[PDB]
Design a protein around this motif. Structure first.
Motif, PDB file in Angstrom:
ATOM      1  N   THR A 132       0.541  -1.087  -0.044  1.00 52.47           N
ATOM      2  CA  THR A 132       0.000  -0.077   0.097  1.00 52.47           C
ATOM      3  C   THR A 132       1.164   1.177   0.065  1.00 52.47           C
ATOM      4  O   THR A 132       2.019   1.185   0.317  1.00 52.47           O
ATOM      5  CB  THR A 132      -1.044  -0.162   1.333  1.00 52.47           C
ATOM      6  N   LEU A 133       0.295   2.428  -0.172  1.00 57.59           N
ATOM      7  CA  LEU A 133       0.882   3.700  -0.264  1.00 57.59           C
ATOM      8  C   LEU A 133       0.337   4.633   0.953  1.00 57.59           C
ATOM      9  O   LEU A 133      -0.935   4.848   0.694  1.00 57.59           O
ATOM     10  CB  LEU A 133       1.171   4.327  -1.693  1.00 57.59           C
ATOM     11  N   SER A 134       0.805   5.110   1.885  1.00 58.24           N
ATOM     12  CA  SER A 134       0.457   6.087   2.758  1.00 58.24           C
ATOM     13  C   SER A 134       0.784   7.484   2.249  1.00 58.24           C
ATOM     14  O   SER A 134       1.877   7.917   2.639  1.00 58.24           O
ATOM     15  CB  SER A 134       0.971   5.885   4.318  1.00 58.24           C
ATOM     16  N   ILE A 135      -0.286   8.096   1.847  1.00 57.87           N
ATOM     17  CA  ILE A 135       0.066   9.385   1.535  1.00 57.87           C
ATOM     18  C   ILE A 135      -1.028  10.493   2.229  1.00 57.87           C
ATOM     19  O   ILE A 135      -1.936   9.975   3.207  1.00 57.87           O
ATOM     20  CB  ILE A 135      -0.102   9.865  -0.042  1.00 57.87           C
ATOM     21  N   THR A 136      -1.126  11.687   1.823  1.00 60.43           N
ATOM     22  CA  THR A 136      -1.999  12.670   2.421  1.00 60.43           C
ATOM     23  C   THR A 136      -3.074  13.025   1.745  1.00 60.43           C
ATOM     24  O   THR A 136      -2.897  12.966   0.310  1.00 60.43           O
ATOM     25  CB  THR A 136      -1.242  14.054   2.949  1.00 60.43           C
ATOM     26  N   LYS A 137      -4.048  14.003   2.012  1.00 67.14           N
ATOM     27  CA  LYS A 137      -5.204  14.464   1.190  1.00 67.14           C
ATOM     28  C   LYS A 137      -4.736  15.502   0.278  1.00 67.14           C
ATOM     29  O   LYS A 137      -3.647  15.959   0.792  1.00 67.14           O
ATOM     30  CB  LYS A 137      -6.169  14.584   2.048  1.00 67.14           C
ATOM     31  N   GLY A 138      -5.599  15.699  -0.725  1.00 64.35           N
ATOM     32  CA  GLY A 138      -5.034  16.829  -1.663  1.00 64.35           C
ATOM     33  C   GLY A 138      -3.562  16.811  -1.863  1.00 64.35           C
ATOM     34  O   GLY A 138      -3.066  17.923  -1.927  1.00 64.35           O
ATOM     35  N   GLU A 139      -2.870  15.558  -1.816  1.00 56.91           N
ATOM     36  CA  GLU A 139      -1.467  15.239  -1.912  1.00 56.91           C
ATOM     37  C   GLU A 139      -1.305  15.270  -3.416  1.00 56.91           C
ATOM     38  O   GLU A 139      -2.084  15.134  -4.257  1.00 56.91           O
ATOM     39  CB  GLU A 139      -0.718  14.276  -1.310  1.00 56.91           C
ATOM     40  N   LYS A 140      -0.004  15.920  -3.557  1.00 53.51           N
ATOM     41  CA  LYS A 140       0.647  15.772  -5.147  1.00 53.51           C
ATOM     42  C   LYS A 140       1.095  14.224  -5.437  1.00 53.51           C
ATOM     43  O   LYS A 140       2.148  13.905  -5.357  1.00 53.51           O
ATOM     44  CB  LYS A 140       1.924  16.682  -5.179  1.00 53.51           C
ATOM     45  N   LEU A 141      -0.070  13.523  -5.852  1.00 54.65           N
ATOM     46  CA  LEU A 141       0.090  12.051  -6.079  1.00 54.65           C
ATOM     47  C   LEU A 141      -0.738  11.800  -7.262  1.00 54.65           C
ATOM     48  O   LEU A 141      -2.173  11.754  -7.390  1.00 54.65           O
ATOM     49  CB  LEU A 141      -0.097  11.206  -5.018  1.00 54.65           C
ATOM     50  N   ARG A 142      -0.041  11.342  -8.648  1.00 52.43           N
ATOM     51  CA  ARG A 142      -0.862  11.162  -9.802  1.00 52.43           C
ATOM     52  C   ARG A 142      -0.445   9.775 -10.185  1.00 52.43           C
ATOM     53  O   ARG A 142       0.629   9.241  -9.849  1.00 52.43           O
ATOM     54  CB  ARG A 142      -0.580  12.176 -10.958  1.00 52.43           C
ATOM     55  N   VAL A 143      -1.549   9.141 -10.875  1.00 48.23           N
ATOM     56  CA  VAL A 143      -1.101   7.691 -11.232  1.00 48.23           C
ATOM     57  C   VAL A 143      -0.267   7.661 -12.380  1.00 48.23           C
ATOM     58  O   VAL A 143      -0.445   8.582 -13.250  1.00 48.23           O
ATOM     59  CB  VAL A 143      -2.830   7.177 -11.487  1.00 48.23           C
ATOM     60  N   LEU A 144       0.611   6.610 -12.487  1.00 50.43           N
ATOM     61  CA  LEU A 144       1.655   6.611 -13.585  1.00 50.43           C
ATOM     62  C   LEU A 144       1.408   5.486 -14.271  1.00 50.43           C
ATOM     63  O   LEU A 144       1.329   5.414 -15.708  1.00 50.43           O
ATOM     64  CB  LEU A 144       3.010   6.535 -12.997  1.00 50.43           C
ATOM     65  N   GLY A 145       0.833   4.371 -13.735  1.00 52.14           N
ATOM     66  CA  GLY A 145       0.507   3.171 -14.232  1.00 52.14           C
ATOM     67  C   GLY A 145      -0.670   2.453 -13.619  1.00 52.14           C
ATOM     68  O   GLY A 145      -1.255   2.669 -12.523  1.00 52.14           O
ATOM     69  N   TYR A 146      -1.439   1.435 -14.372  1.00 53.78           N
ATOM     70  CA  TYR A 146      -2.403   0.850 -14.001  1.00 53.78           C
ATOM     71  C   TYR A 146      -2.177  -0.611 -13.783  1.00 53.78           C
ATOM     72  O   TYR A 146      -1.179  -1.153 -14.081  1.00 53.78           O
ATOM     73  CB  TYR A 146      -3.483   1.118 -15.031  1.00 53.78           C
ATOM     74  N   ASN A 147      -3.101  -1.449 -13.068  1.00 58.08           N
ATOM     75  CA  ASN A 147      -3.181  -2.974 -12.917  1.00 58.08           C
ATOM     76  C   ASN A 147      -3.624  -3.511 -14.160  1.00 58.08           C
ATOM     77  O   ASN A 147      -3.884  -4.822 -14.094  1.00 58.08           O
ATOM     78  CB  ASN A 147      -3.822  -3.067 -11.606  1.00 58.08           C
ATOM     79  N   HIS A 148      -3.768  -2.894 -15.297  1.00 58.33           N
ATOM     80  CA  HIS A 148      -4.138  -3.583 -16.480  1.00 58.33           C
ATOM     81  C   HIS A 148      -5.523  -3.680 -16.294  1.00 58.33           C
ATOM     82  O   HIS A 148      -6.252  -4.645 -16.885  1.00 58.33           O
ATOM     83  CB  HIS A 148      -3.466  -4.872 -16.771  1.00 58.33           C
ATOM     84  N   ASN A 149      -6.360  -2.752 -15.673  1.00 60.06           N
ATOM     85  CA  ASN A 149      -7.822  -2.819 -15.700  1.00 60.06           C
ATOM     86  C   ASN A 149      -8.134  -1.659 -14.695  1.00 60.06           C
ATOM     87  O   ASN A 149      -7.456  -0.819 -14.678  1.00 60.06           O
ATOM     88  CB  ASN A 149      -8.328  -4.022 -14.724  1.00 60.06           C
ATOM     89  N   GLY A 150      -9.502  -1.564 -14.441  1.00 59.39           N
ATOM     90  CA  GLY A 150     -10.066  -0.474 -13.776  1.00 59.39           C
ATOM     91  C   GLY A 150     -10.492  -0.813 -12.159  1.00 59.39           C
ATOM     92  O   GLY A 150     -11.722  -0.630 -11.974  1.00 59.39           O
ATOM     93  N   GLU A 151      -9.386  -1.054 -11.689  1.00 57.68           N
ATOM     94  CA  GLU A 151      -9.469  -1.774 -10.014  1.00 57.68           C
ATOM     95  C   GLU A 151      -8.479  -0.619  -9.357  1.00 57.68           C
ATOM     96  O   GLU A 151      -9.088  -0.025  -8.586  1.00 57.68           O
ATOM     97  CB  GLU A 151      -9.257  -3.070 -10.020  1.00 57.68           C
ATOM     98  N   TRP A 152      -7.458  -0.943  -9.628  1.00 59.28           N
ATOM     99  CA  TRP A 152      -6.259  -0.210  -8.729  1.00 59.28           C
ATOM    100  C   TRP A 152      -5.132   0.241  -9.902  1.00 59.28           C
ATOM    101  O   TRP A 152      -4.947  -0.307 -10.781  1.00 59.28           O
ATOM    102  CB  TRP A 152      -5.696  -1.096  -7.538  1.00 59.28           C
ATOM    103  N   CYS A 153      -4.537   1.274  -9.336  1.00 58.52           N
ATOM    104  CA  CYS A 153      -3.381   1.686 -10.096  1.00 58.52           C
ATOM    105  C   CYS A 153      -2.280   2.080  -9.408  1.00 58.52           C
ATOM    106  O   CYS A 153      -2.340   2.577  -8.202  1.00 58.52           O
ATOM    107  CB  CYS A 153      -3.732   3.174 -11.037  1.00 58.52           C
TER     108      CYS A 153
END
Length: 57
Positions: free
Chosen positions: A16-37
């Protein structure tokens, strides 16, 4: 389009990844589906649910 970090997260394990709200975190890759990235963090890396991140539109 690209999505940005919206809600925060909580630690869980060595996956998992522990981050903060409204934090600067953008998806780079996906799990090859629309579940998790996979996303990265200035602190490190980890998984990030799409339910925790929203698009810029």
């Amino acid at each position: 389009s690209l999505f940005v970090a919206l809600y925060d997260f909580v630690a869980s394990g060595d996956n998992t990844l522990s981050i903060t709200k409204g934090e600067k975190l953008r998806v780079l890759g996906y799990n090859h589906n629309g579940e998790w990235c996979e996303a990265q963090t200035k602190n490190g890396q980890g998984w990030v649910p799409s339910n925790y991140i929203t698009p810029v539109s």
